[PDB]
């Protein structure tokens, strides 16, 4: 079984550690981003051909991370995304160098 598989919750395509939660409708589980989010089949969380939220930008950062790519690489990737500051402070939570380098990382605040 993959360590870390996706998960679409709560309005985003979210990823989770699968040494840690199983997952299953109704039943919360946390995500890489520290959200605890419960799937539900009137948002189409579980039929996987169906998930067209989008991808959950921590998750997708913190997933990158956890396997290892260097800053640079994981700054390609966040440059992808809209990055508001409920979501800058989530992904500086979950990352361990200082809120600057989150920001300049997320590329969201630089033209
Ligand atoms: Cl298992
Ligand atoms: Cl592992
Ligand atoms: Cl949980
Ligand atoms: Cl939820
Ligand atoms: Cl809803
Ligand atoms: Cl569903
Ligand atoms: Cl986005
Ligand atoms: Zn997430």
Same mark, same amino acid.
């Given at each position: 079984? *993959?360590?870390?598989? !996706?998960? *679409?919750?709560?309005?985003?395509?979210?990823?989770?550690?699968?040494?840690?939660?199983?997952?299953?409708?109704?039943?919360?589980?946390?995500?890489?981003?520290?959200?605890?989010?419960?799937?539900?089949?009137?948002?189409?969380? &579980?039929?996987?051909?169906?998930?067209?939220?989008?991808?959950?930008?921590?998750?997708?950062?913190?997933?990158?991370?956890?396997?290892? !790519?260097?800053?640079? %690489?994981?700054?390609?990737?966040?440059?992808?995304?809209? !990055?508001?500051?409920?979501?800058?402070?989530?992904?500086? %939570?979950?990352?361990?160098?200082?809120?600057? %380098?989150?920001? %300049? &990382?997320?590329?969201?605040?630089?033209?």
């Amino acid at each position: 079984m *993959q360590r870390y598989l !996706w998960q *679409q919750a709560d309005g985003k395509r979210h990823v989770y550690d699968t040494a840690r939660h199983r997952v299953q409708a109704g039943r919360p589980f946390t995500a890489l981003c520290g959200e605890t989010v419960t799937p539900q089949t009137e948002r189409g969380d &579980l039929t996987a051909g169906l998930w067209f939220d989008g991808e959950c930008p921590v998750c997708t950062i913190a997933l990158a991370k956890a396997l290892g !790519w260097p800053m640079r %690489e994981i700054s390609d990737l966040a440059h992808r995304f809209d !990055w508001s500051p409920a979501l800058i402070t989530r992904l500086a %939570e979950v990352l361990h160098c200082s809120f600057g %380098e989150v920001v %300049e &990382l997320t590329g969201a605040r630089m033209v």
